């Protein structure tokens, strides 16, 4: 029963217990979002199919790892979504092949945010897996913890919808330029949705954030926004309607705003968060 | 410490008055001003009007003096006319003695629209190198104001030549050869040295 | 040269500031209680009196000078005094140049001379005058008169 | 010469210089004549003596017999009672008011107490091909009011564009004469002397330079010596006698003439009356921070802060400045800043070495409290060298460097409201340089550079210019290069450009009455090193007689670089009406198409009504000559009277004489004055009347007799009819004016005898001058 | 903050309009009698200069002189008379040399500014010649 994979193949460390270094495709799904399939990676074979048929089950308590450790989902043991965190012991997969055959476990996620997500770095602990390899051969149970690290820094959905990306940075054509704001949002499922804003404003009308220029600050002009005629007050949820798998833009255009009087020339800088609302 | 505008006056034709600033600079002494014009013959006949003709001045002052016609076009308009402004300055108020001071300056009535532009006159004086003398003939309607006569070596005398006029001057024979001289412009300044042409 | 700046002008000529000198007489019958001298009695301490020929122009360079006054009857080259009962008797005033030479009264312009000047820098005339006992003797009294200098210019 | 000692009535001289004629008592003592007077200090101060100039004299009595030849050196008294004079020799330092052009300040004007408005509206309209039309509306507002010395000023505006008030600026102020200074309450800005320019509201008390005779203005090295006998010193520079005077014996000093370090150096030549000349030379350069010795410049500034940013604070403060001139080229100075979170203190001296070029180093330490309550100290220092003109046409105009700590900051760095103006990248040091070179006769090249370093970031801001002039005698050759570069951005900031200017008067008759002598054109080109070569021709000049209206025409062309080629076009007319000034400009550049209008003016609330006219400068004279209609005030452009007889001029220097001249030729045929010229010395902010005695009526010479005689000369005459009065010429003649047609005349010479009476025929009316003859009463 | 957006920029100052380009003042004609002493001078005379219609953020402008001075540093006459030099200063009493520069502020509202300046003339050596008088000076600008 030698196992391998392609990307990381981190060491079976302390017996059959291990770390792993894997790439990620966390997928927005109806019901529970996909996180990671392990048959994509884990190619285990029985070195002697003739002597032994390895009986690998998982014992319970195999939870997520790091800050992920507080969460629920399912886990597709042999394709069967069994509830997560692991509160029972699952059946066995038999191993009687020299073919490094895929290991049929895919991970699911109970979605709790709006469309949100948790970004994870490479190498950090993702999950803790209390497996258990007995065999037909004898009573050689050895039980072991497969720990999950990454080789990349991937965002996992926490809500049930999805955007183009979470990070857009722009610079205006300079005075009095104004830009359409390119981002589209789809879902897995038709959901009435909404959104509001976040950041320190300038105006009491909640429509002008400040220039947080770092060096050589231009002053007197802050951050005005619109959708198509529509100057937006901060922290007010604009609806979206029942949006499913169609990635729909939000019609937005960023703008200068003459805050006060004397206008200081120079450099301009501001970062703005958005907040999404289940409706 | 008294002074005038300048030295020389044109009355162009068509004019009305002529203005003349005169000035004492001293801040106490008082002066009485008479003003009268004679002809080029030195005869006072009141033909032109100076106002105010008689006054006084105590302290550092000034007066602008206006001068008017009183002939009504009775003059040969073919050429300019010389008169003499006669300016009497009187100290006002023990075995003493003082002076009165007169400015006697020229006057050139220039008529309207004479032929030659006046700058083009300085080249038109002709001559006749005559014995111990010189003849110096004006074909033009201008009074001519000449100095620095350096006939070769000898620096010689000043001259006024009448409009349509001439002059004959003395010549000491112990001189050089070439007639070299300067004259006066319409602004008092020296015109450059030129060269004389006789016969 | 996004904007342009221009001044024009000329210079105007100016004459001469002329300051005089008034001389008191304080001889007080030195000459006349002693003499008793002929009509050539121009024994009188002369006074160098000055003329301030300053300031002036620049082309101002040489002029013509001249004097007018009441010619005395005996010598027309003497100044008769004021016709005063409080005056003296038998005197006529002689003018002398800075070279101490008697000056012709009321001479016409034809005889005059071009007083050559220092352009710019100042000048000053420093002449003399005295009293010539015309009648013999001279009685006491006041010594009062006026005279006139005219300068015809360059 | 000599009379026995005692009291004499004697014409007191002072180096032959007459003062008065006092009975003076003499004693057998010490002079050239073995005798001493008994003089009083009250006499001597009444004679020219600065009494405090001689120490030990205030401790004396008032009238004690002054031991002058002993208490004062180089001091002789000499009586000559054959002419009764007292020739007195004194070292010049014991007199006063030797400032050439001194003015006594009690001759100064307060003025009137009266109000003031100054307005201006202007605006434009632009048509865009894409977008259209654009209309702009701004009216400006400057009122003021004066009571004696209470000077109150406010400015504000109103707005509207294609839209309201805004209160702007206000202060009331007043000077103090013995304190020689000026205090102001209200809006203000500080001065860039040691520290930086700061707008504020408060109290501001500053010494005023502009009281000085300007021979005191500027620094000059104060020159000391001692004359033995009476001498005459000539002083030269560049071969020119820059100063001459005959000098009395004694110690002396020189506080004199306007300085010029780029005239070379001083050529001192002292001719004592023997003929012996005390020769040396005197060096001269200058710091712009210099003081001439005895002066003391100061200010006292306090109040509340004003900026114009919403993100700051407006606290109270204080700041003090002071300077005083010193011997031997040394220079003390100093102010300091005293405010809330903050204190800042300079330390001083600068000096001219004379032979080595002038130089100054100064250093300031400050204590600071940042808005995150991190509190710091820091120091800074600055270095300024000057070296004057050499014989090779070469001037070192400025050498400047300044440096500071990291912990050094400014008060303005503290003023804010929220924390995190990027203060983590304060400057380290700053370099500047100013030198040109005279180029022969007909050329000159100008060279300038500056340099700026920061703590933190590795970026330096720099600026550079080189400008060359050549003139071929009408022809104006211009070639210059610019080069700056900046930290917050990218690109090398440069430009090369050129011009030749050409006038038109230099080809024609100078006395042709064409306006075409008052016209000129020029042509210029440039390139950016980056494709754009550009050029420009412009023809412009004056217009009808007073040139109050005048024209400007130009166009140029642009090419290269961005592919934005293009022709231009500008045509503009400006007229100045007597009521105020107005112009219209126009641009067309093929996409840009726009038109320009604006009317200013000034309003006066005075006692005789209200006056209207052109824009205003701070001190205006009323012209009061009632009856004038259209009056050419001489050397004054667009300046006439109203239909009433009044005018104004805003034009003012002050503490200085001013001259008021009027044309006769613009006058009417019936009104006369007495002197068309006035003269003033105003102060700052004042108002003057220009009163002139007008004489409306008929103008006339008469030749009048009585007792079959022209009456005796120079007698006095008044009109019984009019107010006008006259002085009798010879021949029984007098000219008068301002007269009616019929009436009667009073004449006094002895005791008043003559009374004449008259009536001219009325047909004598198209004549300005009439003449007749008559007799008197007596 | 579901999605954070970083927006940047810069504003730079552009040329405004002039109000004029065309300053010219004659002063009349006087006396080297009155200008006889070395270093005698004229009477001052006023000049105001506006520049209008300023783009946004533009705050300060430097004026950049040009003229033909002689070795005095004062400007050479181009008229016929001699010994005569020229005198421009600010109304803070500071010498405006050829080539020199001076930055001023800009009013926020009116998109414009002015230049309070004073001009007279002078002799240096005294006793100038009599004749004509000509003078022309140029000026360019930089923006801030």
């Amino acid at each position: 029963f030698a196992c391998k994979t392609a990307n990381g193949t981190a060491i079976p460390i302390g017996g059959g217990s291990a770390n792993v270094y894997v790439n990620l495709a966390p997928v927005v799904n109806v019901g529970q979002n996909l996180v990671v399939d392990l048959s994509t990676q884990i190619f285990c074979h029985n070195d002697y199919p003739e002597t032994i048929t390895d009986y690998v089950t998982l014992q319970r308590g195999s939870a997520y790892g790091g800050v992920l450790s507080n969460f629920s989902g399912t886990v597709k043991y042999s394709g069967s979504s069994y509830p997560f965190p692991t509160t029972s012991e699952t059946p066995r997969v038999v191993y009687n092949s020299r073919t490094d055959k895929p290991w049929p476990v895919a991970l699911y996620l109970t979605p709790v945010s709006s469309a949100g997500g948790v970004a994870i770095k490479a190498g950090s602990l993702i999950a803790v897996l209390i497996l258990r390899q007995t065999n037909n051969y004898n009573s050689d149970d050895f039980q072991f913890v497969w720990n999950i690290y990454a080789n990349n820094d991937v965002v996992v959905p926490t809500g049930g919808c999805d955007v183009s990306a979470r990070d857009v940075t722009v610079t205006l054509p300079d005075y009095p330029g104004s830009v359409p704001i390119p981002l589209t949002v789809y879902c897995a499922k038709s959901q009435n949705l909404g959104y509001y804003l976040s950041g320190t404003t300038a105006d009491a009308g909640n429509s002008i954030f400040t220039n947080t220029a770092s060096f050589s600050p231009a002053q007197g002009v802050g951050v005005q926004l619109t959708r198509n005629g529509t100057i937006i007050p901060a922290n007010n949820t604009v609806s979206l309607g029942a949006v499913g798998t169609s990635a729909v833009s939000l019609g937005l255009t960023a703008n200068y705003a003459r805050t006060g009087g004397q206008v200081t020339a120079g450099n301009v800088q501001s970062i703005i968060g958005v907040t999404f609302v289940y409706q | 410490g008294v002074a005038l505008g300048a030295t020389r006056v044109i009355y162009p034709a068509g004019q009305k008055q002529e203005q003349l600033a005169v000035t004492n600079n001293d801040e106490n002494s008082t002066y009485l001003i008479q003003s009268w014009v004679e002809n080029a013959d030195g005869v006072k006949d009141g033909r032109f009007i100076v106002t105010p003709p008689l006054f006084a001045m105590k302290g550092k002052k000034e007066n602008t003096l206006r001068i008017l016609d009183a002939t009504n076009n009775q003059l040969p308009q073919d050429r300019e006319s010389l008169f003499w402004m006669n300016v009497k300055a009187i100290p006002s108020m023990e075995n003493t003695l003082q002076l009165a001071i007169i400015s006697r300056i020229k006057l050139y009535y220039r008529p309207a629209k004479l032929a030659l532009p006046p700058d083009q006159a300085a080249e038109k004086l002709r001559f006749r190198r005559s014995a111990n003398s010189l003849t110096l003939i004006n074909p033009t309607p201008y009074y001519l104001t000449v100095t620095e006569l350096n006939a070769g070596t000898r620096v010689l005398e000043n001259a006024l030549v009448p409009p349509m006029g001439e002059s004959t001057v003395k010549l000491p024979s112990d001189a050089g050869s070439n007639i070299t001289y300067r004259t006066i412009n319409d602004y008092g300044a020296l015109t450059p040295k030129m060269t004389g042409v006789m016969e | 040269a996004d904007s342009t700046i221009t001044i024009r002008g000329y210079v105007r000529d100016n004459g001469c500031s002329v300051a005089a000198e008034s001389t008191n007489f304080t001889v007080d019958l030195m000459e006349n209680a002693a003499k008793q001298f002929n009509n050539i009695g121009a024994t009188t301490p002369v006074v160098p009196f000055r003329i301030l020929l300053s300031p002036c122009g620049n082309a101002v360079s040489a002029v013509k000078v001249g004097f007018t006054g009441v010619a005395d009857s005996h010598n027309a080259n003497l100044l008769a005094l004021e016709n005063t009962v409080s005056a003296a008797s038998g005197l006529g005033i002689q003018l002398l140049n800075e070279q101490q030479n008697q000056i012709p009264l009321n001479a016409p312009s034809s005889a005059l001379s071009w007083t050559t000047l220092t352009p710019g820098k100042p000048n000053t005339l420093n002449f003399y005058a005295r009293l010539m006992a015309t009648q013999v003797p001279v009685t006491a009294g006041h010594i009062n008169a006026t005279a006139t200098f005219t300068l015809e210019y360059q | 010469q000599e009379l026995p000692p005692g009291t004499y009535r004697v014409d007191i001289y002072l180096n032959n210089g007459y003062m008065a004629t006092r009975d003076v008592t003499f004693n057998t003592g010490d002079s050239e004549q073995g005798i001493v007077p008994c003089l009083t200090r009250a006499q001597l101060a009444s004679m020219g003596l600065n009494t405090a100039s001689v120490a030990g004299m205030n401790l004396l009595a008032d009238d004690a017999c002054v031991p002058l030849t002993t208490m004062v050196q180089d001091a002789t008294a000499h009586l000559d009672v054959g002419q009764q004079r007292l020739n007195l020799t004194i070292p010049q330092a014991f007199m006063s008011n030797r400032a050439r052009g001194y003015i006594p300040p009690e001759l100064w004007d307060p003025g009137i107490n009266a109000g003031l408005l100054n307005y201006n509206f202007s605006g434009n309209s632009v048509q865009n091909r894409i977008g259209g039309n654009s209309h702009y509306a701004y009216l400006n507002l400057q009122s003021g009011l004066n009571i004696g010395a209470w000077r109150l000023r406010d400015n504000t505006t109103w707005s509207y564009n294609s839209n309201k008030w805004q209160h702007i600026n206000t202060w009331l102020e007043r000077d103090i004469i013995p304190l020689r200074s000026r205090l102001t309450l209200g809006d203000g800005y500080t001065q860039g002397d040691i520290f930086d320019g700061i707008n504020f509201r408060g109290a501001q008390l500053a010494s005023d330079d502009n009281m000085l005779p300007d021979s005191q203005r500027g620094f000059a090295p104060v020159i000391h010596g001692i004359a033995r006998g009476t001498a005459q010193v000539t002083i030269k520079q560049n071969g020119y006698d820059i100063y001459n005077s005959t000098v009395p014996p004694g110690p002396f000093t020189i506080n004199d003439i306007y300085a010029a370090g780029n005239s070379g150096d001083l050529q001192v030549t002292i001719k004592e009356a023997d003929g012996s000349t005390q020769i040396f030379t005197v060096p001269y350069s200058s710091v712009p921070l210099l003081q001439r010795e005895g002066h003391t410049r100061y200010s006292i500034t306090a109040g509340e802060y004003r900026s114009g940013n919403a993100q700051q604070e407006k606290p109270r403060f204080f700041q003090s400045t002071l300077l005083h001139g010193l011997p031997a080229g040394w220079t003390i100075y100093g102010g300091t800043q005293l405010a809330d979170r903050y204190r800042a203190f300079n330390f001083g001296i600068g000096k001219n070495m004379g032979a080595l070029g002038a130089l100054s180093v100064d250093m300031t330490q400050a204590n600071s409290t940042l808005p995150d309550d991190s509190q710091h100290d820091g120091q800074s220092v600055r270095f300024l060298y000057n070296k004057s003109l050499n014989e090779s046409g070469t001037n070192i105009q400025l050498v400047g460097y300044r440096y500071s700590t990291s912990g050094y900051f400014n008060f303005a760095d503290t003023t804010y409201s929220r924390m995190n103006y990027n203060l983590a990248y304060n400057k380290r040091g700053k370099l500047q340089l100013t030198v040109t070179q005279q180029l022969g006769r007909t050329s000159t090249l100008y060279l300038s550079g500056s340099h700026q370093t920061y703590w933190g970031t590795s970026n330096v801001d720099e600026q550079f210019q080189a400008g060359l002039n050549t003139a071929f005698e009408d022809i104006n050759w211009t070639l210059s290069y610019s080069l700056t570069k900046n930290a917050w951005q990218k690109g090398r900031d440069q430009m090369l450009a050129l011009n030749v200017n050409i006038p038109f008067s230099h080809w024609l008759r100078s006395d042709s009455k064409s306006q075409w002598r008052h016209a000129s054109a020029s042509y210029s080109m440039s390139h950016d090193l980056n494709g754009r070569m550009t050029n420009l021709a412009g023809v412009y000049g004056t217009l009808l007689e007073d040139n109050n209206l005048s024209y400007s025409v130009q166009t140029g062309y642009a090419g290269g670089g961005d592919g934005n080629s293009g022709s231009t076009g500008y045509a503009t007319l400006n007229y100045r009406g007597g009521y105020g000034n107005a112009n219209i400009g126009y641009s067309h550049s093929d996409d840009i198409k726009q038109l320009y209008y604006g009317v200013s003016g000034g309003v006066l609330a005075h006692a005789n009504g209200v006056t209207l006219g052109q824009p205003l400068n701070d001190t205006v004279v009323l012209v009061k000559a009632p009856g004038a209609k259209d009056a050419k005030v001489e050397n004054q452009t667009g300046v006439r009277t109203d239909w009433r007889g009044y005018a104004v001029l805003p034009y003012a220097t002050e503490y200085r004489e001013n001259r008021v001249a009027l044309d006769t030729n613009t006058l009417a045929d019936n009104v006369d004055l007495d002197n068309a010229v006035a003269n003033v010395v105003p102060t700052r902010g004042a108002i003057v009347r220009a009163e002139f005695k007008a004489r409306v009526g008929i103008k006339l010479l008469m030749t009048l007799t009585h007792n079959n005689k022209p009456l005796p000369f120079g007698a006095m005459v008044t009109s019984e009819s009019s107010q006008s009065s006259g002085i009798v010429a010879d021949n029984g003649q007098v000219y008068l004016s301002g007269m009616p047609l019929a009436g009667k005349v009073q004449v006094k010479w002895g005791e008043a005898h003559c009374v004449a009476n008259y009536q001219l025929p009325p047909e004598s009316q198209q004549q300005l001058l009439t003449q007749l003859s008559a007799e008197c009463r007596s | 903050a579901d999605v954070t957006i970083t927006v940047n920029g810069k504003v730079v100052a552009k040329p405004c309009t002039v109000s004029t380009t065309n300053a010219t003042v004659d002063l009349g004609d006087l006396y080297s009698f009155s200008l006889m002493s070395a270093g005698a001078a004229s009477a001052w005379h006023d000049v105001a200069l506006e520049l209008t219609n300023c783009p946004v953020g533009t705050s300060r402008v430097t004026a950049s002189f040009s003229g033909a001075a002689d070795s005095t540093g004062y400007y050479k006459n181009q008229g016929t008379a001699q010994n005569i030099q020229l005198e421009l200063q600010d109304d803070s009493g500071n010498t405006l040399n050829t080539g020199a520069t001076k930055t001023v502020q800009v009013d926020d509202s009116s998109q414009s500014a002015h230049f309070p300046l004073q001009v007279r003339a002078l002799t240096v050596n005294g006793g100038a010649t009599q004749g004509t008088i000509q003078a022309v000076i140029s000026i360019t600008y930089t923006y801030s």
Side-chain angles (χ1 to χ4, degrees), chain D residues 752-759 761-762 764-765:
Chain D
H753 290 96
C754 162
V755 169
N757 49 0
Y758 65 96
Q759 178 173 0
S764 62
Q765 196 60 45

Short mmCIF file of all heavy atoms in Angstrom, two decimals, chain D residues 752-765, unseen atoms left out:
data_model
loop_
_atom_site.label_atom_id
_atom_site.label_comp_id
_atom_site.label_asym_id
_atom_site.label_seq_id
_atom_site.Cartn_x
_atom_site.Cartn_y
_atom_site.Cartn_z
N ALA D 752 -7.16 153.91 0.22
CA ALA D 752 -7.87 153.57 -1.00
C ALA D 752 -8.43 154.82 -1.64
O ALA D 752 -9.22 155.54 -1.03
CB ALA D 752 -8.98 152.59 -0.73
N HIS D 753 -8.02 155.10 -2.87
CA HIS D 753 -8.53 156.29 -3.52
C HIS D 753 -9.37 155.95 -4.74
O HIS D 753 -10.54 156.34 -4.82
CB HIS D 753 -7.39 157.21 -3.93
CG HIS D 753 -6.71 157.86 -2.78
ND1 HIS D 753 -5.55 157.37 -2.22
CD2 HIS D 753 -7.03 158.97 -2.07
CE1 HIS D 753 -5.18 158.16 -1.22
NE2 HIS D 753 -6.07 159.13 -1.11
N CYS D 754 -8.79 155.23 -5.69
CA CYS D 754 -9.47 155.03 -6.96
C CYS D 754 -10.60 154.02 -6.88
O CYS D 754 -10.48 152.97 -6.26
CB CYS D 754 -8.49 154.59 -8.04
SG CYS D 754 -9.33 153.83 -9.45
N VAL D 755 -11.70 154.39 -7.52
CA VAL D 755 -12.82 153.50 -7.81
C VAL D 755 -13.17 153.72 -9.27
O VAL D 755 -13.57 154.81 -9.67
CB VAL D 755 -14.03 153.77 -6.92
CG1 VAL D 755 -15.26 153.03 -7.43
CG2 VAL D 755 -13.72 153.36 -5.50
N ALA D 756 -13.00 152.68 -10.07
CA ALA D 756 -13.41 152.73 -11.45
C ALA D 756 -14.77 152.08 -11.59
O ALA D 756 -15.31 151.52 -10.65
CB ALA D 756 -12.40 152.03 -12.35
N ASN D 757 -15.31 152.15 -12.80
CA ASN D 757 -16.55 151.48 -13.10
C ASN D 757 -16.61 151.24 -14.59
O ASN D 757 -15.92 151.91 -15.36
CB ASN D 757 -17.76 152.29 -12.62
CG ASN D 757 -17.69 153.72 -13.06
OD1 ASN D 757 -16.75 154.15 -13.72
ND2 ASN D 757 -18.71 154.48 -12.69
N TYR D 758 -17.44 150.29 -15.00
CA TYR D 758 -17.29 149.82 -16.36
C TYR D 758 -18.58 149.20 -16.86
O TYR D 758 -19.44 148.79 -16.08
CB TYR D 758 -16.17 148.79 -16.47
CG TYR D 758 -16.44 147.51 -15.70
CD1 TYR D 758 -16.97 146.39 -16.34
CD2 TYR D 758 -16.12 147.41 -14.35
CE1 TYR D 758 -17.20 145.22 -15.64
CE2 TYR D 758 -16.35 146.24 -13.66
CZ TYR D 758 -16.90 145.15 -14.30
OH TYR D 758 -17.13 143.98 -13.62
N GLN D 759 -18.65 149.10 -18.18
CA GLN D 759 -19.47 148.12 -18.87
C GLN D 759 -18.89 147.94 -20.27
O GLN D 759 -18.80 148.90 -21.05
CB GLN D 759 -20.93 148.50 -18.95
CG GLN D 759 -21.68 147.46 -19.72
CD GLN D 759 -23.16 147.65 -19.70
OE1 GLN D 759 -23.67 148.59 -19.10
NE2 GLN D 759 -23.88 146.76 -20.37
N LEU D 760 -18.49 146.72 -20.58
CA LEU D 760 -18.15 146.39 -21.95
C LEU D 760 -19.43 146.12 -22.74
O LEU D 760 -20.45 145.73 -22.17
CB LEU D 760 -17.25 145.16 -21.98
N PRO D 761 -19.41 146.35 -24.05
CA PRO D 761 -20.52 145.89 -24.88
C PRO D 761 -20.55 144.37 -24.93
O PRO D 761 -19.50 143.72 -24.87
CB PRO D 761 -20.20 146.49 -26.26
CG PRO D 761 -18.74 146.71 -26.24
CD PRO D 761 -18.41 147.09 -24.83
N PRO D 762 -21.74 143.78 -25.03
CA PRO D 762 -21.85 142.32 -24.93
C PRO D 762 -21.32 141.58 -26.14
O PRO D 762 -21.03 140.38 -26.04
CB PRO D 762 -23.36 142.10 -24.78
CG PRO D 762 -23.91 143.42 -24.34
CD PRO D 762 -23.06 144.44 -25.02
N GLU D 763 -21.17 142.26 -27.29
CA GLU D 763 -20.69 141.62 -28.51
C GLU D 763 -19.24 141.19 -28.39
O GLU D 763 -18.80 140.32 -29.16
CB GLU D 763 -20.86 142.57 -29.69
N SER D 764 -18.50 141.75 -27.45
CA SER D 764 -17.19 141.25 -27.04
C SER D 764 -17.32 139.94 -26.29
O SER D 764 -17.09 139.87 -25.08
CB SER D 764 -16.50 142.31 -26.19
OG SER D 764 -17.26 142.55 -25.02
N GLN D 765 -17.73 138.88 -26.98
CA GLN D 765 -17.99 137.62 -26.30
C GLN D 765 -17.31 136.44 -26.96
O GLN D 765 -16.88 135.51 -26.26
CB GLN D 765 -19.50 137.38 -26.22
CG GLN D 765 -19.84 136.32 -25.22
CD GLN D 765 -19.38 136.71 -23.84
OE1 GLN D 765 -19.57 137.85 -23.40
NE2 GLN D 765 -18.73 135.78 -23.15
#
